[PDB]
Design a binder for this molecule. Structure first.
Ligand SMILES: Nc1ncnc2c1ncn2[C@@H]1O[C@H](COP(=O)(O)OP(=O)(O)O)[C@@H](O)[C@H]1O
Lengths: 75, 182
């Protein structure tokens, strides 16, 4: 009796939850495009020590020479 | 001493090569000189641009070509040197300059200054012990075995007819027109 005789206007006997009952791609047939089985370390060893050098790494839309192709120095 | 020379057959466009006493010129290809017609950024390619050899056929639609041996006469000395350096590659030669002599071909009626500069290259930059260059008609004589006769040869842009009896020259008798297949 927290407030039974005290206050007769407070809720009880209420099942306000509203229940229910327990009642519970890879079309590779085509020949469209391949994939590669990821192995980050394999590709890491693939691109292992490419000493690419960026001498004059310029790719602007400048017009003053013949052509521009950076990422060119090697070992 | 033992230094087998290398028979190197030049030509208008094509060059052939193989050691002495062989039967087939071990390496043959033309004056194709290429370098990438495009721009690469992403890693995976090769670097240097002087990519001439089987890679050129492998990468035809990628590089720009040129032929500096105009009518059998060298223009881009530097590039010809590079070509010859490519010839000097291991899988291409494995030998050194001083290690072996070389035989070469002379297309007649050309300025000898070409030969001058080239001789300076092969005997100063490279240091070949001896290098002889000669008339291509003599080559045909040995192939035929005969010594009398005329021989008109034609590469890709030069034609020359050589009338020589018994291997004995008649320089005035020789004639030519330098234009062919190109
Ligand atoms: N199958 C072919 N049909 C027509 N012409 C050819 C053929 N093969 C080669 N040629 C031409 O004949 C020439 C061969 O003569 P050669 O003097 O050996 O040439 P090069 O002077 O270029 O070495 C080549 O330069 C080429 O232009």
């Amino acid at each position: 009796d927290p407030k039974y005789a005290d206050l007769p206007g407070i809720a009880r006997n209420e099942p306000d939850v509203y229940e229910t009952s327990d009642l519970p791609q890879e079309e590779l047939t085509s020949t469209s495009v391949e994939h590669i089985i990821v192995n980050p370390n394999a590709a890491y060893d693939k691109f292992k020590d490419k000493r690419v050098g960026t001498k004059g790494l310029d790719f602007s839309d400048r017009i003053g020479k013949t052509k521009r192709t950076g990422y060119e120095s090697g070992e | 001493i033992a230094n087998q020379p290398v028979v190197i057959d030049n030509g208008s466009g094509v060059i052939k090569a193989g050691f002495a006493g062989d039967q087939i010129p071990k390496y043959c290809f033309p004056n194709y000189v290429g370098r990438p017609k495009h721009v690469r950024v992403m890693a995976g390619a090769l670097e240097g641009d002087i990519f001439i050899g089987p890679k050129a056929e492998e990468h035809r639609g990628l590089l720009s070509i040129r032929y500096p041996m105009e009518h059998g006469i060298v223009k881009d000395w530097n590039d010809m040197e590079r070509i010859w350096q490519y010839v000097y590659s291991k899988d291409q030669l494995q030998t050194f300059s001083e290690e072996h002599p070389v035989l070469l071909t002379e297309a007649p009626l050309n300025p000898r200054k070409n030969r001058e500069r080239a001789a300076e290259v092969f005997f100063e930059t490279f240091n070949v012990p001896a290098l002889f260059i000669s008339m291509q008609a003599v080559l045909s004589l040995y192939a035929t075995g005969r010594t009398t006769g005329v021989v008109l040869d034609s590469g890709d842009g030069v034609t020359h007819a050589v009338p020589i009896y018994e291997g004995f020259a008649m320089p005035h008798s020789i004639m030519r027109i330098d234009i062919a297949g190109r």
